[PDB]
């Protein structure tokens, strides 16, 4: 059927850092007014739903805590359905709390999983232990492949680099471009891919993931990707707009 | 809901080369008898549905031409929904016919796409032209990432290698582990991921793709992957059996 | 000691394709007049010394056949000192003749080496056989890593790509940036690295190789590399000039 | 001429960790008795010459501090000859002191170089700053490519991984397999490659570097590499022995 659910990326679409993109509030309110399930997605694992709601509210956009879905929440949802509840975690804040709520024990003693998110406390010891466990068979999971956040701030992908180099193994990244996180988002809305659209600014992450997941896609040009980037692209967005302000196919 | 549709990989699951895996016939007939939509999937683009039906029949397994779905068919289905109908193709047989049926013009003059499948006629000239077009912006699509077929026979992935090296660009692979081909298979059965299971022998292709697509997965040990390969695996199969002969959760 | 020998790269330094770089003739004649051993180096394996002398003469630059040293000659020199004289060769012309003169038997029956140069006859069969032999333990050698020649013409590196993909092994590239070819060039002049300078236009090949080999280096800006490319460079050229016309430290 | 100088790798050749390889003492004393210049090489940057002499003496092998040459010393020697004397260093101990003796100022303010060695204090902040500087044009140098030391202890290569991922740039590794460190070792002995042999246990580092540098090579089987590893090897050692105990071609 038609568009009945909406997954909308955050950075470069609804927010520029801590400043809302013009029209974001009206765009979101229009969707909620119509009663369409909505998920605001972000590949970063540092913020809780409340943190995000506060960030949005500070910027003048009001939405419920419940609409947010981060790679940390997605990782917890992924692990919930797994056997084994012991993990060595390289991360802090949101991810840690989510894992505890998923019934996990966080330990550096016989862990079943090595989970990497983001932490400014990352150090030689963590890289060492994570590499040791992964090399020894621990299930290697990471929240998102992004190498850095704002500026050149190390992000999950950068923290995994040393661990991968030493162990010779790569983690399963839960976030975009992996199609699984889109599946997780759909399950959160109890929605089907055929009636869901994803709005994003990055052709290589939002669009690629949505496409592979079977979703209709809308690329906005207010972020990373530019219009000429679609010319040579294997697949292309269902629609393209300068920003969410002109989206009216929903 | 429950399992209502089935995607079953071919090589290492139903066939060993030209010899059927014991129990394959009974397994498939049981599924069809129950009236469950069935798709027999293969990442290789060389055979037509009829070729595959004949191969199966020669091996003592009788199934309709219609159940087969190859990376060539999937590629044609992918391109059908695309704008532009001119392509420079590096391939032969099945793929070529499928593209013509999808309304394509195959040309080395201003092609919109560069499509790579498999062809034993692959040569310096083809690599040159493909690289030239891709470097110049043509949409780069490939049927499957496999580097070789039986023995060390070059396969699609190997043919793309030189083109990627020269152009500095990578193609969008339509086949496994890409989740999209699973989506295409579901659409072929008009089925939902939540009620579909995929049976395969390769953890890194059948299982990875099925998992990302939201399908229940069954790993058989009659092919590439072995049981101990799941220990360190980020995700694991819903079920594991020596072969299709013992599968009875369908 | 001082500069007593000279290795000078060809393309982008002395020639632009078939046209001489202004000042090339005078530059070379000045070196020969002083009696300094000279080697004109090129990473490409297609031309014989006579072909190169003819190309230079056609462009108005007169030099002896003996001064030229190609990756094909270097590869033959490399193999001369090796045990085993049976090789499966993916190449044509110059390289083939050089190997025969080095005492080799070219065969697809129990070859000791798999040697890849350049050949416009490259095809599926060659990739297959080369991959089969390398996968089975044959010593994998390639003339140069360049992915393409003029335009997007496949070069040695591109021909190796498919073979590497299938076999899972990489060849030993004889040409630049490998320091060995510089050693081979020095031996050709019976010269020491401490009294030899190399002139080149590519920071990542001529300069990198010369530097690692212990040679003084001169970068000309008449080719691939540009002046701003040295800012972030780990190592830098001993000298930099727009072209050979202003070189006077020799 | 003949062998007049000797470069001998340490780990897996003369030492197993803190235990000497049987015959090491006699091997080394024999070389020094003959008056042949000797350099004991190691790719690791953590120990000073005195530390190494003490380690050897504790193991029962007596040699002068002066014979040792580490990747830290080699890096300092490399930088001594460079313009610019400001560097942001990710490392500790030996490397730091060597840089100060080379006339460097270590700072995180407008550094000319970003130098990575080894430090158990490596953290998010260091990765961030190093990545920021490299991304902004700083000359990226690293002591050695090894990903880990003993066990799964992070080594230089692992520390560079995150920096490379964020900046998109790779460093120039001073240590093996880079031929430059062999050149540096020769200069330390004021020796020519044609009269120098290198003894090592790793085909991919000691042997590869020696070969590219024009040295005669001796592979011992007391460490990383095994005899069957030479079968498919592009190049092969001049000689091969179980350990230094049987080396008598010097
Ligand atoms: Mg975004
Ligand atoms: Mg299979
Ligand atoms: Mg050049
Ligand atoms: Mg060693």
Q: What is the 3-state secondary structure (H, E, C) of C48-81?
A: CHHHHHHHHHHCCCCCCHHHEEEHHHHHHHHHHC
Quick check: D154 and A119 CB within 8 A? no
Residue A170 is encoded by which pair of tokens?
Answer: 């790569």
Instruction: Tell me the C-alpha to C-alpha distance, in Å, between residue A237 and each of A163, A193, B170, D137.
Output: 35, 15, 19, 36
3-state secondary structure of D83: coil
Please give, rounded to a whole number of angstroms, the shortest distance from the CA of A95 to a CA of chain D.
18
Q: Are the beta carbons of A180 and B211 separated by less than 8 Å? A: yes
Contact between A179 and B213 using a beta-carbon 8 Å cutoff? yes
Tell me the shortest Cα–Cα distance from B34 to chain C, in angstroms.
42
Strand D139-142 and strand D113-116: the pairing is parallel
- Element of type H or E holding C199: strand C196-200
From the list D138, D178, D236, the residue facing C212 with the nearest CB is: D178
Span from the CA of A152 to the centroid of ligand 1 (angstroms):
16
Inter-residue long-range contacts of B213-221, CB under 8 Å, 24+ positions, other chains counted: B213/A179, B213/A183, B213/A213, B213/B179, B213/B182, B213/B183, B213/B186, B214/A180, B214/A183, B214/A186, B214/A187, B215/B7, B215/B182, B216/B3, B218/B247, B218/B249, B220/B12, B220/B13, B220/B244, B220/B247
DSSP letter assigned to residue C123 = B
Do chains D and C meet with 3 or more Cβ pairs nearer than 8 Å?
A: yes
- Find the A188 Cα to ligand 1 centroid distance in Å: 20
- Option in D132, D158, D164 nearest A152 (CB): D132
How many interface pairs between C and D have CB atoms less than 8 angstroms apart?
A: 63
Tokens 């894992």 belong to residue: A99
Touching C (3+ Cβ pairs <8 A), the chains are B, D
Contact (Cβ atoms closer than 8 angstroms) between residue D3 and residue D197: yes
Q: For an interface test with C, give the residue of B116, B138, B163, B165 to mutate (most C CBs within 10 A).
A: B165
| Beta strands D196-200 and A239-241, pairing class | unpaired
Q: Which of residues 165-204 of C touch B (CB under 8 A)?
A: 165-167
* CA A26 centroid distance within chain: 23
A218-222 CB contacts, 8 Å cutoff, 24+ apart: A218/A247, A218/A249, A220/A12, A220/A13, A220/A244, A220/A247, A222/A12, A222/A13, A222/A16, A222/A21
* Alpha carbons B24 and B182: distance in angstroms, whole number: 21
Could you tell me which of A190, A155, A194, A189 has the C-alpha nearest to residue A175?
A155
With beta carbons less than 8 A apart as the criterion, state whether D119 and D154 touch.
no
Question: Do you find a cis peptide bond into B15, omega within 30 degrees of 0?
Answer: no
Nearest CA in chain B to A231: B137
Which residues face B216 on adjacent strands?
A: B197
- Please check whether residue B115 is in contact with residue B145, taking contact to mean a CB–CB distance below 8 angstroms: no
Using DSSP, state whether B164 is helix, strand or coil: helix
Q: How far is the CA of A224 from the centre of ligand 1 (A)?
A: 7
In 3D space, the residue among B95, C153, C11, D151 whose CA is nearest the CA of residue A167 turns out to be D151
With a CB cutoff of 8 Å and minimum separation 6, the contacts of D3 are D36, D195, D196, D197, D216, D249, D250
**Ligand 1 mean position, distance from CA A3 (Å):** 21
Inform me whether the C-beta atom of residue C58 falls under 8 Å from chain B C-beta atoms.
no
Q: Where are the alpha helices (DSSP H) in chain A?
A: 24-33, 49-58, 71-80, 94-101, 124-135, 156-167, 180-189, 208-212
Q: Shortest CB distance from C128 goes to which of B128, B135, B154? A: B154
What are the extents of the domains in chain A? Answer: 1-70+175-250, 71-174
Which DSSP helix (H) or strand (E) runs through B182?
A: helix B180-189
Contact B53/B64 with Cβ under 8 angstroms?
Answer: yes
Q: Is the peptide bond before C20 cis (omega within 30 degrees of 0)?
A: no
The Cα of D25 is separated from the nearest Cα of chain C by a number of Å equal to: 32
Q: Cα–Cα distances in Å, from D15 out to D52, D73, D197?
A: 11, 20, 19
Whether the CB-CB separation of C39 and C22 falls below 8 Å is answered with: no
Query: Pairing mode, if any, of strands A239-241 and D86-90?
Result: unpaired
Establish if D119 touches chain A: CB-CB under 8 angstroms: yes
CA C121 distance to own-chain centroid = 21
CA distance A45 to A109: 24
State the Cα–Cα distance between residues B220 and B218, nearest whole angstrom.
6
C-beta atoms surrounding C245 within 10 Å: 15
* D1-70+175-250: CATH class: alpha beta
A236 neighbourhood in chain B, CB within 8 Å: 82-83
CA distance A65 to D195: 74
Q: Is B227 in CB contact (< 8 Å) with chain A?
A: no
Contact at CB, B169 and A232, closer than 8 angstroms? yes
What whole-number distance in Å separates Cα of residue C13 and Cα of residue C220? 7
> What does each C-alpha distance from A25 to A13, A30, A53, A137, C74 come to in angstroms?
11, 8, 13, 47, 67
Report CA(C72)–ligand 3 centroid distance (Å): 16
| Angstrom distance (rounded) from CA A196 to CA A152 | 34
- Taking the CA of B44 as reference, the closest ligand is 2
For chain B, the residues before each gap (C–N > 2.5 Å) are none
Domain A1-70+175-250 identical in fold to domain A71-174: yes
For residues C133 and C167, give the distance between their C-alpha atoms in angstroms, rounded to a whole number: 9
Buried b (16+ CB within 10 A) or exposed e, A92-125: bbbbbebbeebebeeebeebbbbbbbbbeebbbe
B221 and B207 in contact (C-beta within 8 Å)? Answer: no
Which residues of chain D are within 8 Å of residue C179 when distances are taken between CB atoms?
A: 179, 212-213
Q: Would you name the residues of A annotated as active-site residues?
A: 9, 11
Task: Kindly provide the b/e burial profile for residues B137-176, where b requires at least 16 CB atoms within 10 angstroms of the residue's own CB.
Answer: ebbbbbbbbbbbbeebbbbbbbbbbbbbbbbebebbbbbb
- CATH homologous superfamily of A71-174 equals HAD superfamily/HAD-like (3.40.50.1000)
B192 SS3 class: coil
B200 closest CA partner among B74, B39, B49: B39
Question: CA-CA distance, D126 to D137, in Å (whole number)?
Answer: 17
Residue of D nearest to A155 (CA): D166
Which residues on A lie below 8 Å from D167 (Cβ)? 152
Residue A235 main-chain phi, psi, to 5 deg: -120, 160
CB of D108 closer than 8 Å to CB of A113: no
C-alpha span between D30 and D34 (Å, rounded): 6
Separation between Cα atoms, residue B244 and residue B246, nearest integer Å: 5
- C-beta separation of C116 from C160 below 8 A: yes
What distance in Å separates the CA atoms of residue A209 and residue D35, rounded to the nearest whole number?
A: 67
Instruction: Test D139 with C169 for CB contact under 8 angstroms.
Output: no
Is the peptide bond prior to C250 cis by the omega test (within 30 degrees of 0)? Answer: no
Q: What was the experiment behind these coordinates?
A: X-ray
Q: Which of A131, A158, A167 sits opposite D162 (nearest CB)?
A: A158
Determine contact: D133 vs chain C, CB below 8 A.
no
Residue D144 assigned ligand-binding role: no
CA distance readout (Å), B86 to A227, B104, B121, B161: 22, 6, 21, 23
Determine how many CB atoms are found less than 10 A away from the CB of residue C22: 12
Residue A212 C-alpha, separation from nearest chain B C-alpha, in angstroms: 5
A149 touches chain D (CB under 8 A): no
Residue C155 Cα to ligand 3 midpoint, Å, equals 15
Query: Would the annotation count A77 as a binding residue?
Result: no
d(CA B58, CA B50): 12
Kindly tell me the sign of the dihedral angle through the C-alpha atoms of D15, D21, D25, D30. negative
Q: Which ligand is nearest to the CA of D9?
A: 4
**Interface contact B236-A211, CB threshold 8 A:** no
Q: Which chain B residues are closer than 8 Å to A82 by Cβ?
A: 235-236
* Min Cα separation B123/chain C (Å): 4
Query: Whole-angstrom Cα distance, residue D148 to residue D150?
Result: 7
Is the backbone peptide bond immediately before D177 cis, with ω within 30 degrees of 0?
yes
Q: For testing the chain C interface, which of D192, D214, D238 should be mutated: the one with the most C CBs within 10 Å?
A: D214
List, in order, residues 6 or more apart from D248 with CB less than 8 Å away: none
Give the strand pairing for C15-16 and C19-20: antiparallel
Token code pair at residue C142? 């390639």
For residue A192, give the nearest of B192, B231, B235 by CB distance: B192
Beta carbons within 10 angstroms of residue D62's beta carbon? 12
Residue B40's SS3 state is strand
Take residue A211 and report the two structure tokens written for it: 């496409």
Of B139, B183, B236, the CB nearest to A232: B139
Instruction: Kindly list the distances between the CA atom of residue A148 and the CA atoms of A71, A144, A182, in Å, as whole numbers in the listed order.
Output: 15, 10, 22
User: Any binding-site annotation on B9?
Assistant: yes
User: Could you tell me the resolution of this structure in angstroms?
Assistant: 1.8
8 A C-beta contact, residue C48 and residue C56: no
For chains D and B, having 3+ Cβ pairs within 8 Å is answered no
User: Which ligand is the nearest neighbour of the Cα of D223?
Assistant: 4
Q: What is the distance between the alpha carbons of residues B237 and B249, in angstroms, rounded to a whole number?
A: 13
- List beta partners, residue B106: B87
Q: How far apart are CA B136 and CA D37, in angstroms?
A: 57
Q: Which two tokens stand for residue A120?
A: 């400014």
Give me the count of residues in chain B: 250
Tokens 């293969």 appear where? Answer: B42
Q: What is the CA radius of gyration of chain D?
A: 18
């Amino acid at each position: 059927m038609t568009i009945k659910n909406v997954i909308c990326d955050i950075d470069g679409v609804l927010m520029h850092d801590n400043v809302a993109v013009p029209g974001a509030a009206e765009f979101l309110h229009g969707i909620m007014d119509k009663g369409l399930p909505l998920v605001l997605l972000t590949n970063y694992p540092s913020q809780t739903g409340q943190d995000l709601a506060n960030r949005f509210a500070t910027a003048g956009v009001d939405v419920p805590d419940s609409v947010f879905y981060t790679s940390a929440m997605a990782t917890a949802d992924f692990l919930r359905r797994q056997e084994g509840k012991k993990a060595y975690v390289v991360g802090e804040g949101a991810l840690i709390h989510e894992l505890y709520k998923a019934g996990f024990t966080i330990t550096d003693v016989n862990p079943d999983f090595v989970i990497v998110g983001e932490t400014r406390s990352y150090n030689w010891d963590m890289m060492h232990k994570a590499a040791y466990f992964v090399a020894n068979g621990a299930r290697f999971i990471a929240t998102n492949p992004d190498t850095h956040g704002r500026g050149f701030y190390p992000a999950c992908g950068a923290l995994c680099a040393g661990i991968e180099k030493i162990s010779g193994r790569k983690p399963f990244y839960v976030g975009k471009p992996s199609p699984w996180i889109i599946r997780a988002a759909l399950n959160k809305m109890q929605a089907h891919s055929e009636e869901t659209v994803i709005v994003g600014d990055n052709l290589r992450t939002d669009i690629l993931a949505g496409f592979q997941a079977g979703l209709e896609t809308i690329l906005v040009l207010s972020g990373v990707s530019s219009l000429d980037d679609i010319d040579s692209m294997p697949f292309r967005p269902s629609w393209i707009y300068p920003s969410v302000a002109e989206i009216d196919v929903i």
